[PDB]
Design a protein around this ligand. Structure first.
Ligand SMILES: CC(C)CN(C[C@@H](O)[C@H](Cc1ccccc1)NC(=O)O[C@H]1CO[C@H]2OCC[C@H]21)S(=O)(=O)c1ccc2c(c1)OCO2
Ligand SMILES: [Cl-]
Ligand SMILES: [Cl-]
Ligand code: NA
Lengths: 99, 99
């Protein structure tokens, strides 16, 4: 698709068996999802934005379906106000910014 | 241009006759720049990011060049970690997300 930016670029994702809404976010290095369980190992991380930092759990090699496109990568889980698909997964579905 | 996302989508902006670097950020509703002087009156605004809320100064109808494209619109000034170009100006330069 071609997604305009008059409104937030929200899409449906599937992660850990669950359907969620998430923001396609070119300003995010990393993918950050609201608290949920995921399988496998994790390690703690701090990530920072407007407002400061939050502590997250870093899960590696997680499969995510993003508007019908499968990708794998690292997913951070923690108290983000919104689910964010960052560049680490946008690259894998071939997303570009065009103007 | 068609900008891929393997690296941060940083562009040159020009505001108040000065060049700065800024991040093209589809996850930002608003454009937020680091402290600088801008003409005119400002109004209060609170914006919520990953770590919580901050107060910013809202300046309307500011001339700003983005990657060589002319925009005139709202610029928020405050303690953002990076200059961010949000959807209010990404729409003005005709940007879309494509995959
Ligand atoms: C601030 C930029 C450099 C980084 N952020 C991504 C943004 O797209 C963020 C994504 C975001 C969106 C909504 C709520 C929280 C974060 N948007 C945001 O802060 O926008 C603010 C300005 O416009 C307003 O509209 C949205 C909130 C305001 S982020 O959420 O802090 C973030 C995401 C993933 C990360 C990261 C930081 O560090 C490493 O991986
Ligand atoms: Cl990754
Ligand atoms: Cl590519
Ligand atoms: Na893992």
């Amino acid at each position: 698709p071609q997604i305009t930016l008059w409104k937030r670029p929200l899409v449906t994702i599937k992660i850990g068996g669950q359907l969620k809404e998430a923001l396609l976010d070119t300003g995010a290095d990393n993918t950050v999802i609201e608290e949920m369980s995921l399988p496998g190992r994790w390690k703690p991380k701090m990530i920072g934005g407007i407002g400061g930092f939050i502590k997250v759990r870093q899960y590696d090699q997680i499969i995510i379906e993003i508007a019908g496109h499968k990708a794998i990568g690292t997913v951070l889980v923690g108290p983000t106000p919104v689910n964010i698909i960052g560049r680490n997964l946008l690259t894998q579905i071939g997303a570009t910014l065009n103007f």
